[PDB]
Amino acid sequence: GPDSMRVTQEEIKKEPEKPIDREKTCPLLLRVFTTNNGRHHRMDEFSRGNVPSSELQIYTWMDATLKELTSLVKEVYPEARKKGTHFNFAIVFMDLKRPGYRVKEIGSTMSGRKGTDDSMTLQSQKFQIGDYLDIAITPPNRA
Known part of the structure; x- marks a missing residue:
């Protein structure tokens, strides 16, 4: 008859994500790159050992949400506070097949x-220390 078998990784039933005990966890250093041209940085801008020459560094935790992070970005780029300003987030991560980086x-x-991704966390997206965060900021109403 049919045999029992171990479940493959894709079909593994995972528990719901949990908050981090931030008081007992050392924060991670998050490197955030930003654009104002309407698109993410290209992967050629992360190649050959280089990164974009502007960046924001933040101490945070794996349960950081997109809204929490945009609040910090607004501290340094106040024009982005204008109602309707759009922040598009991507994770830039090492390419394991070819040299350089990939983006998601x-x-x-x-x-x-209020929007549907406001509470989206780094951990929910399998962010890893070592990855970069790229935020493409665009003005209200797709100006």
Whole structure:
């Protein structure tokens, strides 16, 4: 008859994500790159040992949410506080097949508006220390 077998990784039933005990966990250093041209940085900008020459560094935890992070970005780039400003987040991560980096868009938020990705966390998107965060910021109403 049919045999029992171990479940493959893709079909593994995972528990719901849990908050981090931030008081007992040393924060990670998150490197955030930003654009204002309407698109993410290209992967050629992360090649040959280089990164973009502007960046924001943040101490945070694996349960950091997109809204928490945009609040910090707004501290340094106040024009981005304008209601309707759009923040498009992507994780830039090492390419394991070829040299350099790859990118995966994860979600977006908007100044002054509640949205479905506001509570999306780094851990939910399998962010790893060593990865970069890229945020493409665009003005209200797709101006």
